């Protein structure tokens, strides 16, 4: 269910790497989730905190990981904000337009974080945001 998605032994290894008193902080749990190839947002983090507080047992941590699976994510879902700014419907946005979107709203990235991500995808100024989305989903 979650094991379909991620490596079972890495789940335990990353837990042991970060646990303290047999518990793991939400920040370390989200770090681990990312290493396992999952994508938590602040919504997932607020949700697990409301259930259990800031420090998760191993079992609560596994629950948190299932919450982070997000098997509904796909390109259609991801591009919506970008497409909305693509007034002329070209399929492209400039790096500046994309950096502004990523750093201004939502779980905003720092300027550097956005720059690194956009540069990692392409050396060109005009970005195919659908392909950019396919790439981050990997």
């Amino acid at each position: 269910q979650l094991e379909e998605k991620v490596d079972e032994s890495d789940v335990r290894i990353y837990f042991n790497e970060k646990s303290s008193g047999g518990k793991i902080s939400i920040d370390n749990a989200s770090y681990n989730a990312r290493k396992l190839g999952l994508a938590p947002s602040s919504i997932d983090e607020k949700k697990i905190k409301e259930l259990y507080g800031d420090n998760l047992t191993y079992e609560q941590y596994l629950e948190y990981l299932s919450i982070c699976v997000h098997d509904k994510d796909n390109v259609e879902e991801l591009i919506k904000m970008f497409a909305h700014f693509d007034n002329n419907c070209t399929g492209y946005l400039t790096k500046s337009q994309m950096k502004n979107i990523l750093t201004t709203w939502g779980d905003a990235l720092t300027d550097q974080e956005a720059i690194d991500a956009l540069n990692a995808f392409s050396s060109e100024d005009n970005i195919d945001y659908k392909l950019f989305c396919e790439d981050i989903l990997q």
Binding site: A39, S41, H70, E77, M81, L102, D107, A108, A120, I136
Partner: peptide, 17 residues
């Protein structure tokens, strides 16, 4: 739009790690 943006930012943070 905003919820979709969070999923974008989430996958970007995943790639950083």
């Amino acid at each position: 739009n905003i919820x979709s943006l969070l999923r974008v930012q989430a996958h970007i943070r995943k790639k950083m790690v």
